[PDB]
Design an enzyme around this catalytic site. Structure first.
Site, PDB file in Angstrom:
ATOM      1  CB  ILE A   1      -0.965   0.051   1.199  1.00 11.30           C
ATOM      2  CG1 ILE A   1      -0.222  -0.193   2.510  1.00 11.30           C
ATOM      3  CG2 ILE A   1      -2.127  -0.894   1.017  1.00 11.30           C
ATOM      4  CD1 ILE A   1      -1.106  -0.091   3.744  1.00 11.30           C
TER       5      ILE A   1
ATOM      6  CG  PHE B   1       0.380  -1.581   9.020  1.00 16.00           C
ATOM      7  CD1 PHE B   1      -0.517  -0.749   8.371  1.00 16.00           C
ATOM      8  CD2 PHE B   1       0.413  -2.921   8.667  1.00 16.00           C
ATOM      9  CE1 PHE B   1      -1.384  -1.248   7.407  1.00 16.00           C
ATOM     10  CE2 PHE B   1      -0.448  -3.425   7.696  1.00 16.00           C
ATOM     11  CZ  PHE B   1      -1.348  -2.588   7.068  1.00 16.00           C
TER      12      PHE B   1
END
EC number: 5.2.1.8
Length: 108
Positions: free
Chosen positions: A57, A100
């Site tokens: 991403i 994350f």
């Protein structure tokens, strides 16, 4: 928004990934509510991607590039830098902000 990088543990503060290098990372991926949806630590195998090839991403490409070798950081990623309005069926909902926990182990 974009990607926010918060340090958890410092790296060497000198070695930053350049385009075309392979980043070797351990990561845990969580929804904003805290639910884990993906983790390389649970597989006990680090994850490798080549920076600048869009194998990950956009939030990772811009976030990991801000990390030094050995650093552990928390990336908070808005859906436009992530899976967007579509999300990912049965894994990531629409318009999801993702968090994350990423450790940059080495560059190849």
């Amino acid at each position: 928004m974009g990607v926010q990088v918060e340090t958890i543990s410092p790296g060497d503060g000198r070695t930053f990934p350049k385009r075309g290098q392979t980043c070797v990372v351990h990561y845990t991926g969580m929804l904003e509510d805290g639910k884990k949806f993906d983790s390389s630590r649970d597989r006990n195998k680090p994850f490798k991607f080549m920076l600048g090839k869009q194998e990950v991403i956009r939030g990772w490409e811009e976030g990991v590039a801000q990390m030094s070798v050995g650093q552990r950081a928390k990336l908070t990623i808005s859906p436009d830098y992530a899976y967007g309005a579509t999300g990912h069926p049965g894994i990531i909902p629409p318009h999801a902000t993702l968090v994350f926990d990423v450790e940059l182990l080495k560059l190849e």
